[PDB]
Design a protein around this ligand. Structure first.
Ligand code: GLF
Ligand code: ZN
Length: 472
């Protein structure tokens, strides 16, 4: 049967199912309703930066149509909705003056979700730093971001926290550090060679450190000022794609483990254990900032749950560890990516070149976190796959590959959970086709089709699959 034995009965009692979006990717009204620009508005408006010179000015226009989209997620039997608040829609300059119209939007969205029986899971940050803070402070290179982010978080806790009980601070700080400061392909476009300046060997580590310190400061503020009255929780969202040793050799197994540590351990070891992974300390040395004992104690235990975005898996091949002139965070790992074993690809690719369809990667990742980090509460905060541009409407709706994707990946998640992993929830990226960063509207991740000419929504087969699987 097309559900492949899956239903709410196949998951733990009270397991949470939802869908996910982010502000810049779906809201639209980017320069309206009092919203100030983010670094992504500046980046997307520069010719050549995004596919087709597209931008999030209108996106899916969820700003005007949010009740339609909430009605739709309820009709599909979801329990929860993960979305983000745009910092520059609340504080156009990132600090100081509050945009009351922006505040009213999120109030209206939250209230409607609750009216419809959908639990809000709210991200404070999803790549969309206020442009004013980039220009004035240098963004995530500046330790002052801890204070700036904390004041923003404080306002959100105060304003929405009587209703919102499930918060996340950041979304994938690894990707910010990697793409923004190592490779220089996302804003602020920094890297050793880049026109904007930068240093691919040092800046990604500075940035990650400041994300961890800011997360910790925001959570300390929540716990000391708001938690007694509000009784909610705050976590963080981290990306984790799986790494599998190419062979059982000592060096291939070491390589796969090094990749895990540089990928997820970079954040989880501080959040769980209060230090950076030993291998990163050993290889990155004085380029890796040191937490003071007080800072490490603030960071350790500061996530009430760990959000994991899980998409794909790679084979890793090793080498003898070498003394090397530092060049980049990426080269620091001393690993070799490989996409076939025994003459077979690890999986077929979705539309995005990086996205290999490997359902057992989901089991790999969840099992690994369970075994290595004392089985913390995990929420799968995003998982999904994309269709290419230029299909007909009907071709978009017949998304049989995405149906197979979710059935297979959710079967592997169920496998990890049945073996004892503490997973509390699962969220599909995305509710809607949306603005896919550098790919613009050329990549379609939604279980709901969005016609970007007319803005109409049409559920795809994968939406109906969820509705059938999730019926109460
Ligand atoms: O690449 C698909 C999707 O991956 C992650 F979930 C990011 O948080 C999203 O912003 C992105 O659109
Ligand atoms: Zn509109």
């Amino acid at each position: 049967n097309w559900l492949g034995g899956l239903s709410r009965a196949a998951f733990p009692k009270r397991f949470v199912f939802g869908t996910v979006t982010s502000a810049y990717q779906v809201e639209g009204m980017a320069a309206s309703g009092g919203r100030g620009p983010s670094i992504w508005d500046a980046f997307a408006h520069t010719p050549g930066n995004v596919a087709g010179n597209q931008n999030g000015d209108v996106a899916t226009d969820q700003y005007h149509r949010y009740k339609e989209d909430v009605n739709l997620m309820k009709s599909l039997n979801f329990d929860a909705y993960r979305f983000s608040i745009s910092w520059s829609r609340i504080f156009p300059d990132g600090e100081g003056r509050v945009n009351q119209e922006g505040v009213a939007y999120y109030n209206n969205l939250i209230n409607y979700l609750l009216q419809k029986g959908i639990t809000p899971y709210v991200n404070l940050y999803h790549y969309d730093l206020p442009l004013a803070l980039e220009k004035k402070y240098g963004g995530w290179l500046n330790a002052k971001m801890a204070d700036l982010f904390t004041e923003y978080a404080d306002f959100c806790f105060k304003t929405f926290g009587n209703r919102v009980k499930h918060w996340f601070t950041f979304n994938e700080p690894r990707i910010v550090a990697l793409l923004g400061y190592d490779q220089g392909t996302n804003p602020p476009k920094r890297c050793t060679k880049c026109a904007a300046g930068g240093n691919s060997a040092t800046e990604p580590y500075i940035v990650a450190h400041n994300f961890l310190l800011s997360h910790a400061a925001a959570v300390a503020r929540y716990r000391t000022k708001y938690q007694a009255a509000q009784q909610g929780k705050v976590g963080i969202v981290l990306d984790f794609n799986w790494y599998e040793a190419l062979s059982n050799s000592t060096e291939d197994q070491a390589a796969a483990q090094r990749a895990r540590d540089f990928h997820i351990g970079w954040y989880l070891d501080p959040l769980i254990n209060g230090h950076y992974p030993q291998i990163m300390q050993d290889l990155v040395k004085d380029r890796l900032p040191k937490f003071t004992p007080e800072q490490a104690r603030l960071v350790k235990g500061s996530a009430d749950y760990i959000g994991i975005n899980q998409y794909t898996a790679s084979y890793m091949k090793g080498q003898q560890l070498m003394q090397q002139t530092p060049t980049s965070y990426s080269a620091d790992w001393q690993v070799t990516y490989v996409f076939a074993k025994n003459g077979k690809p690890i999986g077929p690719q979705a539309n995005s070149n990086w996205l290999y369809i490997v359902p057992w990667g989901m089991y790999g990742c969840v099992n690994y976190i369970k075994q290595k980090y004392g089985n913390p509460t995990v929420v799968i905060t995003g998982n999904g796959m994309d269709q290419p541009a230029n299909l007909s409407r009907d071709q978009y709706l017949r998304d049989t590959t995405r149906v197979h994707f979710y059935r297979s990946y959710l079967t592997q998640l169920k496998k990890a959970i049945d073996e004892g992993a503490n997973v509390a929830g699962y969220f599909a990226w995305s509710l809607l086709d949306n603005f896919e960063w550098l790919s613009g509207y050329t990549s379609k991740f939604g279980i709901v089709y969005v016609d970007f000419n007319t803005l109409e929504r049409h559920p795809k087969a994968s939406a109906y699959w969820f509705r059938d699987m999730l019926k109460h």
